[PDB]
C-alpha cells in the first residue's frame, strides 16, 4: 500500500472559517457577512415561489429520469442563449451561437476553459481583473492556460481604475484571452458605468482580444436583465464575437440544484455545429451529461409566460433588498457621525461589497461585535437585514473612529 | 472573428446512428438492441416506486436548495461506502476510507482519473481490459493518463480468456493502474467466476497494482448487492486498498439526476481527511459542487428502512426480468432448431450481451428484421420483451442457420 503517504492536508479554506466561526458565537447580536447566498431579510434561505410552481408542475407530469443529450434539454439551452442575448439579437435570430448546458456557472467556465485550452490555437493567455473570484484560478490553471492580470480595483478610492484598465488591457497581446465579470463584479462590487464599457469594448476590439463574459448574477444585480447584460450585448453589437458561462443559482436560487450554460458567439450556424460537435467530445469524459432537475425548473420559468412573469418580480425584489440594505448601511453610518466617505457601499452593485477596511479592523469586529467577515474588507451584503444594518454601522463606526 | 475556421466537425456516434435508424423505421416489430438504459417489459422507461415516494417525500418537507458542501450531502456519502464496502467491512468501521460525490458513475471516474494523474507518483499508465466501455479510453486520456491493456474477453468462446487476463497481468510492471469491472462488465456481459477473482486478486496483490474498480450495476447484476460486490470486498479484504467508482443511474434508475461516489481506501482515517482535503481542491475548479437532487432521493433511499427495503425487491425485479430475458431467447432458440451453442447468452450477466453474430449477419438482422444493434454483435438485453424474444429468437436462427 502506502499510495497516499505523501498527500498532505490542503490549505483551509477562510470562507468556511468564517462560517465556522460564526456558528460557534454566542452573541445573539452576531452576524455572518462572509455567505455567498441570498438571504431574505429574516436570514433564511429563500426558494422561489415560481420555483416552486415549476417544481409542482414537472410532478404532475410524472416525468422519467432518462439521460439528457450530452449539451443538455434543448428548451434550456435554447431559452439560455435568448435571455443572454436578447431576443431579437441577430446572433440568436441567425442561430450562430451554440449553448451547451453545463454544472451551474463553474461547472459551465469549467468546459469553456477547456475548450480554449484544446481549440484555441492563438494563445495560452487568460487575463483576469484584480482582483477576481478566488476559483477564476484554479479553474483556468487547471484548465492549463496561463494566468495574466489587467487592473481593475483601485483601492484608493474604492471604485475602478479605469485608466489603470485601460492603459492595461491597451497592452495586450493581440488575440490573447480576457475574462470580464458582465455585472456585480466579484469581490468588489464595482463595475464600468456604461460609458467606460463602449470604451472597454473599442480597446478589446481594436487588440483582437477573445472577450471570455462571466455573467453570474444577471437580472439580481440591478432586478433588470435588459440592463444587467448590457455590456454583453454591446460587445456582440459592436462586433466581438464572445464566449459566456452564465448561471442560474443566484437569479433563481438554483444553487444546489446546478443549472448553468456555456455559449460561443461563432461566425455561422454551419461553424456553431462544428463547435457543438467538439464540446459534445469534450463533455463525454467529463460527465457523460448533465443534471436534469436544475434544467426543467429553469426551462419551465423562462419558456412559461406566467412563471417568466413572476420571476421578474421576485428577481427585483431580491436585487431591492440588497439595494436597501446598502443605502441603509451608508445612512446609519453617516447618522452615528462617522466622517469618512461611504459612497462606494451605495456604488457598488450586487452581493459583494468591498468596504475598504483594514484587516486589524475587520478583527476588531469579529473580536468585539461579533462580526464576521473574511480579512479583505468583503462583506456579503445578503447577510444585512433591516433589523440589524443599525448595529453593523455603529460597530462600523466604533472600528474606524 | 474567425476563432473557430480550423474547428473540424466531430466523428459521428455509431451507436446513435442506430437509434436514428430505428426511429424511422415504419415496421411495428422493431426492435432497438442498442438502448443504453432499462425498459420495462413493455419497452418504456422506468422510474422505480420507491424513487417516487422518496421525491413526494421532500417536496413534502419543503427543502431548501442551498449549496451542498463540495465533497457532496455527507448522508449520501456515507451510505453509498457502506452499500459498496458492508456494514461490517473493517474499511468502514474504521472510517479509512473518503467518498466524494461525483457527477454520476462518469464524474465520478474523471475525478479519479484526475487525483491519479495529480498524486500517483508511481505511474502514469492505467490499463484496460480488451474490450472495455467506450468512455474509458477519453477519461483517462484526458487525465492525462497513458493507455495500456490486458485481454479479457475470448471471441472464440464468448466467455473470458482468462489465460490472457492471466498471462498480461503477470507481465504489469509493479505499481501500475488497472481497471476492473466490478460486475456486469461493459460491453461484453463476461464476468470472472469467484474462483477466478481469488487468482486474480492473488497476482494483484503480488505485483503490487493499484486497482480501480468500476461499480456501476450493485443489485442491477444479479439482483442481490453483496453477491454484486463480492469482488470488490474481495480484494479489499485481501489487503489491496482500491479506489472505487459508483453509479446510482442503473440500480436506482437515477440516469438524468446523475448520483454517484468516487472512494478512495487509506490506510487510516488521518490519511483519509489528507486525501479528502486534495480530493474538494481538485472538484472545486471543474464544478464547485454537486448536484443535490440525486443525492437527496439515493440518501433518503438507503437511509429510510421501509424505502430501502422496498429498494432491493425493485432493484431484483429489473434482473429478474434481464435474467429471464436471455433465459428466454436461450430456449427459444433450440426451439427453433439452432444447432449452435448459446450458453455465453445465459452465462453473460447484467445489460449487455455479446452474442458472437458477425458483422454481416448483423446487418442482415437490421435490414431483414428491423432488430438494430451495433456490428460488434453486442445487444443490450433492455431492449428485449417477453412480446418479442419470441421474434428475435426467431430472426437470429435465420442469420446463423
Ligand atoms: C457564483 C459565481 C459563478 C457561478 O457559481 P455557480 O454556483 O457555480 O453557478 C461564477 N462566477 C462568479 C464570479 C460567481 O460569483
Ligand atoms: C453506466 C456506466 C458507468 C456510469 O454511467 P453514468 O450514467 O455516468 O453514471 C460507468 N461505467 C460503465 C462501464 C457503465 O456502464
Redesign the interface.
Known amino acids: ?10 490549505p483551509p479554506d477562510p470562507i468556511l472559517g468564517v462560517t465556522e466561526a460564526f456558528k460557534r458565537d454566542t452573541n445573539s447580536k452576531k452576524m455572518n457577512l462572509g455567505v ?2 441570498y438571504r431574505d431579510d429574516n436570514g433564511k ?1 429563500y ?1 422561489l415561489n415560481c ?1 416552486r410552481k415549476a ?2 408542475m414537472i ?1 404532475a407530469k ?1 416525468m ?5 443529450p450530452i449539451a443538455g434539454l434543448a428548451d434550456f439551452t435554447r431559452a439560455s442563449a435568448e435571455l443572454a442575448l436578447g431576443e431579437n439579437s441577430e446572433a440568436f435570430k441567425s442561430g450562430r451561437y451554440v449553448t451547451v448546458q453545463g ?2 456557472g ?2 459551465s467556465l ?1 468546459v469553456g476553459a477547456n475548450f480554449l485550452q484544446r ?4 494563445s495560452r493567455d487568460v487575463y483576469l481583473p484584480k482582483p477576481s473570484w478566488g ?1 477564476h484560478t ?2 483556468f ?2 484548465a492549463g492556460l496561463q494566468l495574466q492580470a489587467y487592473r481593475y480595483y483601485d483601492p484608493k478610492t474604492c471604485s475602478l481604475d479605469f485608466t489603470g484598465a485601460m492603459e492595461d488591457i491597451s497592452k495586450i497581446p493581440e488575440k490573447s484571452i480576457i475574462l470580464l465579470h458582465a455585472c456585480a463584479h466579484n469581490p468588489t462590487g464595482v463595475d464600468p458605468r456604461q460609458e467606460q464599457w463602449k470604451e472597454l469594448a473599442s480597446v478589446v476590439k481594436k487588440r ?1 482580444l ?1 472577450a471570455y463574459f462571466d455573467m453570474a448574477y444577471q437580472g439580481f444585480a440591478s432586478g433588470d436583465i435588459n440592463r444587467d447584460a448590457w455590456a454583453l450585448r454591446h460587445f456582440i453589437e459592436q462586433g466581438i ?1 464572445v464566449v459566456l458561462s452564465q448561471s442560474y ?1 443566484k437569479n433563481m ?6 443549472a448553468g450554460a456555456f455559449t ?1 458567439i ?2 455561422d450556424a454551419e ?1 456553431a ?3 457543438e ?2 464540446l ?3 463533455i ?11 434544467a426543467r425548473i429553469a426551462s419551465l420559468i423562462l419558456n412559461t409566460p406566467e412563471l417568466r412573469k413572476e420571476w421578474l418580480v421576485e428577481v427585483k425584489g431580491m436585487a431591492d433588498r440588497i439595494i436597501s440594505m446598502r443605502t441603509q448601511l451608508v445612512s446609519n453610518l453617516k447618522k452615528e457621525g462617522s466622517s469618512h466617505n461611504w459612497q462606494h457601499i451605495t456604488d457598488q452593485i450586487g452581493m459583494f461589497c468591498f468596504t475598504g477596511l483594514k484587516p486589524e479592523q475587520v478583527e476588531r469586529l469579529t473580536k468585539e461585535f461579533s462580526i464576521y467577515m473574511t480579512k479583505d474588507g468583503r462583506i456579503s451584503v445578503a447577510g444585512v437585514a433591516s433589523s440589524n444594518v443599525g448595529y453593523l454601522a455603529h460597530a462600523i463606526h466604533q472600528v474606524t473612529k
Chains 1, 2 share one sequence.
Open positions: 500500500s502506502s499510495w497516499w503517504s505523501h498527500v498532505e492536508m490542503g455567498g447566498a434561505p426558494v420555483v417544481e409542482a410532478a410524472k422519467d429520469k432518462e439521460y439528457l454544472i451551474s463553474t461547472g469549467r481549440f484555441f490555437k492563438f476559483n484554479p479553474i490553471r487547471d483582437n477573445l464575437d443559482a436560487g438554483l444553487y444546489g440544484e446546478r460561443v461563432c461566425r461553424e455545429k462544428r463547435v460537435s467538439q459534445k467530445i469534450l463525454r469524459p467529463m460527465y457523460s451529461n448533465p443534471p436534469m432537475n436544475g
